[PDB]
Amino acid sequence: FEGGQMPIHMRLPKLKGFKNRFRTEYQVVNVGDINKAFPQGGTVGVDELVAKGLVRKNSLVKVLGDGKLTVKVDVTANKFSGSAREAITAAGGSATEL
Amino acid sequence: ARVKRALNAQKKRRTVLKASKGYRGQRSRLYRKAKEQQLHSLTYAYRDRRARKGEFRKLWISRINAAARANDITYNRLIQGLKAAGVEVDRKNLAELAVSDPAAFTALVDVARAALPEDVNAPS
Amino acid sequence: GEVSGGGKKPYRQKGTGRARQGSTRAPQFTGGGTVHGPKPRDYSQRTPKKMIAAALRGALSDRARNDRIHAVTELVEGQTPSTKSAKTFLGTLTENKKVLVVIGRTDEVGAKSVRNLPGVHVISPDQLNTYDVLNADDVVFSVEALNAYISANSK
Amino acid sequence: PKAKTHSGASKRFRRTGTGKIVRQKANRRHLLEHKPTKRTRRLDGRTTVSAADNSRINKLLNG
RNA sequence: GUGUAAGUGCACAAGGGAGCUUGACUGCGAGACGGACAUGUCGAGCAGGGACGAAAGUCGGGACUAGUGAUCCGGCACCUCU
RNA sequence: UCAACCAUAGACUCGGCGAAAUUGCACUACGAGUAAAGAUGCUCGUUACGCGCGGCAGGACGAAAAGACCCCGGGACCUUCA
RNA sequence: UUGUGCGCCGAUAAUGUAGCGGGGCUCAAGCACACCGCCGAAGCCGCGGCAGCCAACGUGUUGGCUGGGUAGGGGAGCGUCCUGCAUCCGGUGAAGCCGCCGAGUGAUCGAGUGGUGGAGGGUGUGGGAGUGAGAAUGCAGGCAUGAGUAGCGAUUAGGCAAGUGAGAACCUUGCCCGCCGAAAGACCAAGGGUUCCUGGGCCAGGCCAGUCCGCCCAGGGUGAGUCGGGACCUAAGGCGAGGCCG
RNA sequence: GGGGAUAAGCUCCGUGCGUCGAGAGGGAAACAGCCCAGAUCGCCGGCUAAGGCCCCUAAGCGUGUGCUAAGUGGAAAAGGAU
RNA sequence: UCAAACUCCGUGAUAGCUGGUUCUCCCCGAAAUGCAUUUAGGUGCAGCGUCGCAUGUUUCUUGCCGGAGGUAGAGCUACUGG
RNA sequence: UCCGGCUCUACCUGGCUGGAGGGCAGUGAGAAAAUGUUGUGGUUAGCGGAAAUGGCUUGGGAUGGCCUGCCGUAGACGGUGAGAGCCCGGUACGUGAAAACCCGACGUCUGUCUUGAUGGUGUUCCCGAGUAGCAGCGGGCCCGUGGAAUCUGCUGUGAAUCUGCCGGGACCACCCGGUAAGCCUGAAUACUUCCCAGUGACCGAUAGCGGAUUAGUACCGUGAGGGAAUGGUGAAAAGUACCCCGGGAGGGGAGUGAAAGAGUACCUGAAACCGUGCGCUUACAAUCCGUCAGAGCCCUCGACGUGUCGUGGGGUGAUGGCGUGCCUUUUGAAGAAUGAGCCUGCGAGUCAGGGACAUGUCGCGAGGUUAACCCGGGUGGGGUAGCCGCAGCGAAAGCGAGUCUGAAUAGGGCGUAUCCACACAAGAGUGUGUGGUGUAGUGGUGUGUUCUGGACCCGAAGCGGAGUGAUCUACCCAUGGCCAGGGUGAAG
RNA sequence: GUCAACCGAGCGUUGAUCCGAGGAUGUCCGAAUGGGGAAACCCGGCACGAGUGAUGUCGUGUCACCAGGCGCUGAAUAUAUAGGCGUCUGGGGGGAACGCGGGGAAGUGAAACAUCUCAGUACCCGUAGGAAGAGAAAACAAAAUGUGAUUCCGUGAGUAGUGG
């Protein structure tokens, strides 16, 4: 309540659009944490990630190439990004998505 | 859990009403009436503590001045003279002299007579 | 709002001379409602498992370093309680006023024996806690109890 | 019980990554027949909330 | 005299007149004013695509300030959004 | 005009029983003035032996009633082509 | 004739001087210009104690600046009750209350002692609050001022002797007197419920007192073929089998 | 500076102007806003401001030179007057 | 008691309204203005306060240099009007 | 499984109607009644139950202090002449039921399948009708008529039986799931008039249930309905025998008693308030009633000396100066603005909640923490469903340390913890690419504000629902009674 | 028994007082129920029995209402029915909360207010039970090769959304 003048929450426009209730939010992992919790490299699945504690339990996972990559990893996820495709291509690994 | 309040009040009541033995009427029996008068009383004591200085100093001056004027000098010029002469005695003690020993006071009077300027109303 | 009565304006608003009143059970009366009173409430608070266990381990350490944790196989001879036995044995083993005893469930005879003593405050190690430890001066574990405690925590 | 949220403040106020508060701007819907385009163009986008109303808006959004 | 009230300006013309003409555009906008808040005002400069002009360059309405009304709810055209 | 006298119930005195509303205090003067603009309580002056009784009724902005006229806010009830 | 410094008249309201604050003052105690001193405040200084901010140093010392304060913000504390834990006093007298002597910068304190009195309390650390009253035309109880004042309930009017009695204006009797007399007399209904009689009684009550009373206690006492009602009848109206509507 | 009658203890604006509010103490006869001055507590210590020194009231019926005759001082106009 | 009784309950109705709100010390310490307002006695934001962190003299004062103003004043055959 | 008869009928088969061994089940929701045994199975009374007349002192009384012993499957609690493990009552523990009641247990009793089943194979018939559906008004579902499904109420209309029908948020086609309009169904869950046993950082006589006291009583109201007040002798009444004053109350002695400063008005026994004595002071004086100075008198402690000052202290205090109650609200109140007669007791920022934000503290630390619940005589262990963080931009698809707009690397917006070091470009305000330093959140708790709730306390006028009231008064009905006495003199 | 004493008179080891379970008696009003009624007080009938020279009186029982079953009759009126008569079993009212179905507000908040909210709460009705109601898919879901009656708790979620 603001005296009587039409408040901020009644004189500003509403935000535009909707939500698409059927949106699929993915849960991301970045290659930095791969290199920071896989010295030996190797196979990396959803459960291998859940172990180190980088994502949630009911996750639907995505992979992203922020950090450096020199370790070799046979990553398994749902969907990737082209930066991870290329970074795995350069560090010589298996980007075998699902 | 329930806390009767009796003691925690009785304390200050006892205090105040002890401190008002001499007052006259409802100022000497009743807490709601003696509390007020205690406010006024302590306040008037404070004020009088600051002002009895001026009271006594007034008194001392009247005594000094009458003593001097019976020795045929004014107060103002007496103090001019003692200031000039660097004499240090304060007024409480000048008055004590006036009461007890007027001879010594007359001697001091004479000192000031000696040490005053010649032409008191000069432009210096 | 729970007292008896008061649900009638006891007299007029005006003309009377006296004050304004709306119920005969309001706080300023004599018989009237408590205002902000006690109420039936819970006092539990949710301390976590890690803080609790840290407390207990630290407490047992405080006693151990000062050599107040004694062990024992049993307090009694076969299957007949006799408090005189346990009292003499605690006299052998201890002179302090108060003491804790940790005896399991099945070994009921030691419990039934040492229960009645003035100082003692017996416990099962499944409900081992901190107040009961710290209030004591000495602590008497059974060996079964130690083994259970340790192979229950350590894995 | 819980602290219920304010519909309008949720529908006309969002938060970014670093905790900023964001709104849109006014005089955009109707009577555009005479509003020059530059005036129509500084009103697009979003805008960070003022200082003075940040607190009020926090209290509306959260509870 | 300046389309319309008054002021500030205009002869270096922003007054008067003639020829082409649609920038009375689209996508933006550094930095600033004023500022309870929402509003409000100017804005060089970049890009496409143009007008005028020989070119330089000017044109994102009118000599400037007034000429209109937030939000919600609906309506019309277009979209490779659901 | 123009008021006078008389008798009874009271009122006054004595014996008995014995309340009340009201009340910040108190050994509670007057004047000219100052002040929230009408002072028992302040200033400057004047007057006054302490304590009571009957009586008057100028003040104590006297007692009674959280103004009934006015204004604001909320209600109520009444009306009408709201 | 100009300009000046003091002056005159104009001048004049109602409770009482009353337009110096008063007495009084021109033998200025009045105005002006210079001069000399002095009084004067919780100001400044001087001697001391506390405190906050900063700084320097050393295992909390000193120094400079600072310290009015309502709405209000922040910080640090006393006290009361119940409790966890450890210890101390207590029928060789706790608490509580009245005190005296003393203390703390303050809320307050006395493990400092006396009187009264008769069974629980204190201390340190933590916990939790129905946690501190002077005001709400505040609530409950008690007691004051008014006050030993107004009143003591009609317009009929009381009196003398004797009586019992501790005690008599009033209670019992005697003779007077006076009042109502279509009522202030005698009889019923409603209504009340022992108030009626006897005996005893007077700490409460009666607007005084009281041996008295509709007051107190115990006991006693109300008798119907024909009286007013029922068992006899019905009006207004009620209830209402079945019933109809909802 | 506006309105008002260039009246109001009137009303409305300005002001790195003030004080009161929230601020005591001294002076102003008494007197929230005026002048001085911004209270840590104590002292039977001293110096000063504003103001004032005949008595009430502590301090000078102070010094010098002139005016005042009206109790001016200790309210007042247009105007009048050897 | 009647411009729509009384009792219980909803109900501890609600009041931009009046009153009242209890122990101590230490430090700092205001405002009474602006825009809006079914609003003017209330409230929201800005203003002035304190607490904590950050930035360190950026604030303030005095001097000197640089800048626009159209006020007092004055002036008018330097315009508009008398 | 055997047979008895039956398939109208004698005969071969298929199909029924009976009994029999048997099995299954049973007081089940699935049919229903009683039966008699029956369990130290349970409830409805109870009972036993260990160990000090211990010693000295105090005291009226020892249950106290100190010193000696003991019991303990019993040191929980209470009472007893003062705190009692060893006095009493009772506890830990074990015992106990003729009768009735409840649990199952049985054998009765009752049915019930047994005359049977597994599968084959091609087509007709049935699969819950005034219903489902559609239209019109309406209810409630997150959903306020909206594009508004599903569930539904009243009217009106009104279909099919498996290539049938209903749903998967209008609708249509495909796929999916399911088979309405007939019916019953325990366990988990909610609640306490009453009863039994206990617990309390709950009250302790103005509190706590309104009610410790005759309490829904007395009293009030016609009536519904409101609705109070009053606890304590002492260890045990040993409750003052007796005498004196008095009419009696009441009291003084004598007594009881540890104490009558315990007398049935009684534990203690405050203040207001009411008085009696002792000292000072007060009748020429103008007083928010005090304060500063202080004469004089009276009391007291101490050093001394025939009475006497003092580093004194206390009560009164002539006289002088100064001095305009308290609170609230007000620009401003000593205020002739409000409130308060006085005392005593009672009376207002509280609680909940993984609520929100900010901040202290503690654990953990790129991780943190559990909820319901289960097990636990207790406060403890477990429980991964969940939530917060760890990447955002965008209306959305979507992309991703970048992304959105846009034709655009061409500028901008948002984001990439922050700083640090070197570069290149400009000084249109700095940017861009590298390198390393490496990111801190979460759960308890305390404080403050805050949201929802009566939300710091008291206060209306008045709105609504259900009932009580015409014995007063307004009007009407039914039925009775009352209106002295004297005048005028209409119609006929 | 007791507040609550006093007095009187007694009982009890042959087992009292006291406690528990079952029985008996159980005046009158009350759903109240023979009829009536101002609640607890007035009048009766029928069968039997007691009693008086007979009447009066007394005692024991029983007699209301509806719903259903059975039995007899079948009025106007022909079938035959409603109805009438007898018998048998049920129901009737009270209760502190808890439940299910139905009805169903208002002050309040919105700083006014009608839509909305307060609340389908309070209250009212009809019926229950020891618990109730719901309950066996004409359900969810999303192409996962899934789940498999219902209810109550935790979360999802103060979210998707709805809304002058």
Side-chain angles (χ1 to χ4, degrees):
Chain A
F1 170 73
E2 302 187 356
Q5 64 179 4
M6 189 72 83
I8 306 95
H9 60 82
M10 289 171 65
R11 70 180 180 273
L12 297 177
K14 294 173 77 178
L15 296 181
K16 55 179 179 177
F18 68 105
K19 293 282 172 67
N20 192 356
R21 290 161 60 252
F22 306 111
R23 173 165 164 77
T24 65
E25 183 176 2
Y26 290 111
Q27 203 71 52
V28 310
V29 187
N30 277 317
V31 170
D33 289 328
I34 305 304
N35 296 309
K36 290 175 182 186
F38 291 89
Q40 64 185 356
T43 190
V44 173
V46 172
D47 291 328
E48 298 289 326
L49 296 161
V50 170
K52 275 74 175 174
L54 304 180
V55 304
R56 301 177 190 273
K57 68 184 181 181
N58 289 124
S59 296
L60 184 62
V61 181
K62 190 169 179 185
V63 167
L64 297 174
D66 189 3
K68 186 176 181 176
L69 185 62
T70 298
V71 180
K72 181 170 179 174
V73 189
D74 184 358
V75 178
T76 305
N78 306 114
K79 284 164 72 175
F80 299 164
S81 69
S83 297
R85 303 282 177 182
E86 296 290 331
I88 299 292
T89 302
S94 175
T96 52
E97 58 86 19
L98 289 166
Chain B
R2 185 168 179 275
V3 191
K4 287 187 180 179
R5 322 181 306 170
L7 298 167
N8 204 357
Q10 286 281 319
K11 289 184 172 181
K12 60 186 175 188
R13 291 175 189 169
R14 290 161 180 162
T15 290
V16 171
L17 288 158
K18 187 184 177 183
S20 66
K21 284 177 178 171
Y23 295 177
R24 194 177 191 283
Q26 284 185 359
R27 290 92 188 283
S28 175
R29 300 180 175 92
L30 306 184
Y31 175 69
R32 297 181 65 259
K33 269 57 177 288
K35 180 176 173 180
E36 302 175 0
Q37 204 81 49
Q38 282 290 108
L39 305 176
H40 295 288
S41 174
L42 301 170
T43 297
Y44 295 171
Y46 177 86
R47 177 257 281 157
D48 296 333
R49 285 200 294 262
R50 304 299 191 100
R52 60 182 166 187
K53 294 167 177 61
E55 288 172 354
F56 282 113
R57 185 173 165 86
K58 162 178 172 180
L59 182 64
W60 296 339
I61 293 156
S62 297
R63 294 188 175 176
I64 293 159
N65 189 359
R69 285 182 188 269
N71 289 313
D72 194 356
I73 189 172
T74 62
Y75 181 82
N76 51 5
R77 300 300 189 186
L78 176 61
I79 308 312
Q80 186 177 7
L82 301 182
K83 181 187 173 184
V87 182
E88 296 170 353
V89 181
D90 63 354
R91 287 175 177 87
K92 174 165 66 173
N93 292 319
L94 288 169
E96 191 73 26
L97 289 175
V99 174
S100 70
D101 188 2
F105 186 77
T106 300
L108 300 174
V109 171
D110 290 329
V111 170
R113 296 263 181 72
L116 282 163
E118 296 86 2
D119 299 329
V120 295
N121 292 315
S124 295
Chain C
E2 309 187 356
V3 302
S4 173
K8 182 258 174 62
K9 183 167 168 68
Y11 56 93
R12 301 178 189 173
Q13 189 68 27
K14 301 177 87 76
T16 57
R18 300 172 76 199
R20 307 175 299 180
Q21 297 298 331
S23 179
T24 65
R25 300 294 186 191
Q28 62 267 11
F29 291 14
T30 290
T34 295
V35 173
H36 295 305
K39 294 288 185 178
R41 54 183 284 181
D42 191 358
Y43 293 83
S44 70
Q45 60 189 2
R46 304 182 73 210
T47 303
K49 297 171 180 177
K50 286 182 184 168
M51 288 171 72
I52 291 159
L56 188 71
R57 280 98 163 101
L60 296 170
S61 298
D62 177 77
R63 292 293 191 277
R65 296 164 183 175
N66 292 305
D67 193 357
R68 300 288 187 83
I69 290 161
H70 299 283
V72 60
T73 184
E74 284 186 350
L75 298 166
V76 287
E77 189 59 24
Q79 303 175 0
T80 185
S82 67
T83 297
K84 186 177 174 183
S85 298
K87 188 179 178 184
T88 314
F89 179 62
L90 296 175
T92 290
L93 177 55
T94 296
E95 56 185 1
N96 307 123
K97 295 185 179 182
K98 296 165 72 175
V99 70
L100 180 63
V101 173
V102 175
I103 289 172
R105 302 289 182 83
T106 295
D107 190 359
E108 299 181 355
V109 296
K112 290 171 76 72
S113 176
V114 77
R115 178 183 287 171
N116 197 5
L117 293 173
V120 179
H121 184 266
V122 79
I123 270 174
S124 63
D126 291 330
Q127 308 299 315
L128 186 66
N129 53 8
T130 305
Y131 181 71
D132 300 330
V133 174
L134 291 172
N135 197 358
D137 306 336
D138 277 326
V139 178
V140 164
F141 280 100
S142 177
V143 174
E144 299 172 355
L146 282 161
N147 291 115
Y149 183 85
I150 295 163
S151 293
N153 289 317
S154 295
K155 293 187 181 182
Chain D
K2 294 184 183 180
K4 280 184 177 179
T5 313
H6 198 265
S7 299
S10 172
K11 292 182 181 184
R12 279 96 141 227
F13 276 128
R14 289 195 244 125
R15 304 196 188 180
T16 68
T18 191
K20 301 288 178 68
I21 314 296
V22 169
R23 67 184 181 79
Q24 291 189 353
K25 289 185 276 190
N27 275 319
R28 188 66 187 272
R29 305 294 181 195
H30 66 95
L31 297 175
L32 300 172
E33 208 170 5
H34 72 278
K35 289 181 182 174
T37 298
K38 58 192 167 186
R39 183 177 174 182
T40 306
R41 181 171 67 238
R42 71 193 179 192
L43 300 168
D44 67 355
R46 274 81 64 197
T47 298
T48 303
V49 178
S50 66
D53 289 331
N54 185 7
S55 172
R56 185 177 287 277
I57 292 163
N58 283 108
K59 290 186 178 180
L60 294 174
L61 291 167
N62 299 124

